[PDB]
Amino acid sequence: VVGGGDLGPNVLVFDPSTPDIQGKVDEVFRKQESNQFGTDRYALMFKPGTYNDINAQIGFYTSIAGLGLNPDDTTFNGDVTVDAGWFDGNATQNFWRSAENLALNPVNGTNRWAVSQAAPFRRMHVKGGLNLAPDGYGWASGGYIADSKIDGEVGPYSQQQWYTRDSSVGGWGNGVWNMTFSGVEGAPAQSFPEPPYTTLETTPVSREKPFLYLDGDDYKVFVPAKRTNARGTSWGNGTPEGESLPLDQFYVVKPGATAETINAAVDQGLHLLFTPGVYHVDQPIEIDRANTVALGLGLATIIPDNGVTALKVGDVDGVKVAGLLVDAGPVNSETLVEVGSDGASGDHAANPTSLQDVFVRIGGAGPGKATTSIVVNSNDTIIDHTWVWRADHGEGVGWETNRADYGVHVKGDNVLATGLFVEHFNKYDVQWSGENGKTIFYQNEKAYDAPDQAAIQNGDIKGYAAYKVDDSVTTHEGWGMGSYCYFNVNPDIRQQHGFQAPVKPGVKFHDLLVVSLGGKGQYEHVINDIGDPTSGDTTIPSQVVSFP
Numbered sequence: 001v002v003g004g005g006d007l008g009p010n011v012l013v014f015d016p017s018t019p020d021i022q023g024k025v026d027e028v029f030r031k032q033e034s035n036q037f038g039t040d041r042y043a044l045m046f047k048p049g050t051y052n053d054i055n056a057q058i059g060f061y062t063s064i065a066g067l068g069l070n071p072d073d074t075t076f077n078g079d080v081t082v083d084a085g086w087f088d089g090n091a092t093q094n095f096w097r098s099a100e101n102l103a104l105n106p107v108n109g110t111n112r113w114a115v116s117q118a119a120p121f122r123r124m125h126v127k128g129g130l131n132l133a134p135d136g137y138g139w140a141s142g143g144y145i146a147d148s149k150i151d152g153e154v155g156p157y158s159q160q161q162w163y164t165r166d167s168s169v170g171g172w173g174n175g176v177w178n179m180t181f182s183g184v185e186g187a188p189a190q191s192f193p194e195p196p197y198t199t200l201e202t203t204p205v206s207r208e209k210p211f212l213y214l215d216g217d218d219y220k221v222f223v224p225a226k227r228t229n230a231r232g233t234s235w236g237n238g239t240p241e242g243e244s245l246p247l248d249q250f251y252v253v254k255p256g257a258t259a260e261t262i263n264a265a266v267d268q269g270l271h272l273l274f275t276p277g278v279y280h281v282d283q284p285i286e287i288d289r290a291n292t293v294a295l296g297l298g299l300a301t302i303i304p305d306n307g308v309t310a311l312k313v314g315d316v317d318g319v320k321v322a323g324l325l326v327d328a329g330p331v332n333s334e335t336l337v338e339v340g341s342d343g344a345s346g347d348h349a350a351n352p353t354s355l356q357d358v359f360v361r362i363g364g365a366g367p368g369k370a371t372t373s374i375v376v377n378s379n380d381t382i383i384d385h386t387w388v389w390r391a392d393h394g395e396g397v398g399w400e401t402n403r404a405d406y407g408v409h410v411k412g413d414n415v416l417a418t419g420l421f422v423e424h425f426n427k428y429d430v431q432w433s434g435e436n437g438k439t440i441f442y443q444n445e446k447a448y449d450a451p452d453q454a455a456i457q458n459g460d461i462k463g464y465a466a467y468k469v470d471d472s473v474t475t476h477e478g479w480g481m482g483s484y485c486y487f488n489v490n491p492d493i494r495q496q497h498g499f500q501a502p503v504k505p506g507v508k509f510h511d512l513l514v515v516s517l518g519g520k521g522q523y524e525h526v527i528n529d530i531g532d533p534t535s536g537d538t539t540i541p542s543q544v545v546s547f548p
């Protein structure tokens with residue numbers, strides 16, 4: 001297998017002398033603005049330089065990034081904008097897009113990034129304010145900022161929840177249901193429940209997402225080294241610790257690539273660069289070599305056919321999976337993504353495997369089925385930004401039609417999730433069986449389409465927790481976690497709790513909430529049989545500050 005080669009027609013590369021950049025980006029946006037489930041994919045890439053009079057509007061399945069080693073190398077006098085015009089001001093479906101490695105001088109002083117899930121904002125320098133809300137302050141369900149510097153105020157306004165890590169902000173305007181911060185210089189003080197700020201001084205461990213850049217005229221991928229007890233940006237005081245890999249050390253995956261070829265590339269020592277597109281596989285992609293980077297551009301998507309697993313990472317150190325959507329096929333897959341083997345017991349603390357900006361979809365673009373979406377077997381794994389989503393709208397949706405029982409199952413020890421979003425599973429959205437797990441920020445919605453109370457009976461419990469720590473676990477800790485319900489098929493359904501965990505000194509939670517959306521169903525409790533039920537139709541959270 002040969003490494004390197006052209007990035008293909010879905011990677012649009014601009015430099016400051018490119019004619020009609022605005023017209024080019026506008027045409028991508030015209031096509032992608034409302035294209036929620038289409039198969040088209042785009043990566044917009046900007047060579048280092050200064051770009052004037054630019055407003056890059058970002059639609060579905062569109063990534064935008066600069067190609068400098070540092071964010072300020074690629075500067076827009078202008079904006080990278082997501083708004084909600086196509087949905088009449090409602091931003092709750094602004095999914096599957098990304099911005100990375102750019103500096104912005106927004107034209108009116110404020111850049112708008114009004115997104116919901118799977119819309120990461122990484123390694124950005126906003127020289128102004130950042131507005132996360134749609135014009136008109138309608139509903140929005142974000143969001144994720146990492147390794148970024150916002151010189152002025154971040155204004156969430158109507159954003160329901162948000163996670164920011166390892167960043168610097170000049171100010172922070174408000175909280176709604178759950179704004180969580182770890183390692184954020186300028187974060188508002190811990191104040192939950194009012195305002196609902198969950199604030200941690202540092203992030204226990206983080207490792208910034210690898211990214212494509214240009215070293216002179218040569219393409220390379222920069223691979224940041226890990227930080228322990230991280231705080232502030234990695235690039236603020238100049239280039240961080242990390243390694244650069246030349247593009248010729250990557251198999252550049254395009255249409256036509258089989259799992260057999262991809263697997264052969266990894267076995268031969270090549271890393272993986274998935275150009276934007278949709279890749280069907282008839283057997284799992286297997287990454288069994290330590291330190292392999294598997295990096296996707298433009299929301300590159302993998303669909304497993306015939307019920308196979310899409311991606312299996314072996315029991316090795318340092319695998320970095322980033323920027324991929326795994327989209328279930330119509331034939332049920334027992335698992336979509338497995339990190340490590342069943343029973344994996346190896347230590348990877350010094351050099352963990354990570355999933356970053358890995359998104360899963362079951363249904364919505366056609367019928368899709370999977371029993372468990374992500375199984376994390378390997379000890380020390382970092383899950384840093386994931387959205388694992390059983391579709392509630394689109395094509396191929398139904399209680400059976402797109403049944404997906406379990407979202408994420410964590411079996412490894414010392415696993416860390418930062419920015420965990422899991423929604424709509426028929427049974428437990430997240431289950432955690434390994435020891436010493438930590439979650440910083442969780443957002444869940446319960447399945448809308450349970451037909452009746454019996455359909456979600458869980459032994460002698462009504463409903464399955466959105467986040468379940470197994471009763472055998474001795475040590476676990478979670479911060480800033482919310483579960484919301486919208487039982488619209490049968491609003492008489494009651495969900496016993498959002499969270500379930502054993503009662504032990506080393507199993508702790510901080511800042512939990514449950515919310516009924518418009519009275520469609522209600523929660524009886526917050527965690528276990530503790531905390532007040534939700535009531536009425538006005539969407540007021542029920543909260544618990546500390547457990548146990």
Ligand SMILES: [Mg+2]
Pocket residue numbers: 092116141
């Ligand atoms: Mg939503």
Ligand SMILES: [Mg+2]
Pocket residue numbers: 343344345411412413434
């Ligand atoms: Mg174990």
